[PDB]
Amino acid sequence: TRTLWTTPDTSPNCTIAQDKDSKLTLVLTKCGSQILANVSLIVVAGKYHIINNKTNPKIKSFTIKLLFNKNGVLLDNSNLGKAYWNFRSGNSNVSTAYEKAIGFMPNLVAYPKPSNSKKYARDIVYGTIYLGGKPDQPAVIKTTFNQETGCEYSITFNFSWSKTYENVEFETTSFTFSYIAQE
């Protein structure tokens, strides 16, 4: 069945530190009870565009959050802009915002919201991507399901690095993962 995506162009669609400073490319394809996900990031401007940890040793991580309501609709506090997220139609999107995508949401039994109960690590997936496609420029992408407040479901991407990069543009290789679907 279907695919929810950001069209795979390079037009900025995401706000990390300043308005439209990045293009998140995210494709979610439903394969029954699992969602197959493919993600990459291009930071085009602003604080995170060029990393220089000699001049700014403190800049070592940032987060992009996707927050969804009970119908699986993206909420406006998300870093990703609402106009950019929809079911695929060709290399573009359907012309009208979708009303329902619960089949694409991370499963709440697998990945419960924060509560008074024990929190398990299975709601996280780690991966490594590479800045500029260079094998000696790893950064970690940590993806977490359903851990944000103010929403019914969430997918968050935390990008971090441990090396001292000097004038390295933050644009990444791609990473694939999956997660258990709500229905």
Annotated binding-site positions for Zn(2+): 31, 49, 54, 76, 136, 166, 169, 171, 183
Residue-by-residue DSSP string for 157-181: EEEE--S--EEEE-BB--EEEEEEB
Residue with tokens 């800045």, as numbered in its chain: 131
Q: Which does 36 bind (CB under 5 to 8 A by kind): its own copies, Zn ion, none?
A: its own copies
What are the φ and ψ backbone dihedral angles of 6, each rounded to 5 degrees? -95, 130
Q: Which does 166 bind (CB under 5 to 8 A by kind): its own copies, Zn ion, none?
A: none
Nearest approach, Cβ of 65 to its own copies (angstroms)?
Answer: 17
Q: What is the largest CA-CA distance in the chain?
A: 48
Locate 148 and state its tokens.
């944000």
Strands 3-5, 86-89: pairing kind:
antiparallel
Q: Which is nearer to its own copies, 77 or 166 (CB)?
A: 166
**174 is a contact residue toward its own copies (CB under 8 A):** yes
Burial class, 3, CB count within 10 angstroms (exposed 0-12 / middle 13-18 / buried 19+): middle
Burial class, 49, CB count within 10 angstroms (exposed 0-12 / middle 13-18 / buried 19+): middle
Site mask for its own copies (CB under 8 A), range 21-60, x = bound: ----x-x-xxxxxx-x-x-x-x------------------
Residues that bind its own copies (CB under 8 A): 1-3, 5, 7-10, 25, 27, 29-34, 36, 38, 40, 42, 88, 90-91, 107, 109-110, 120-126, 128-133, 135, 140, 142, 171-180, 183
Name the residues that contact Zn ion, by CB under 5 A: 169
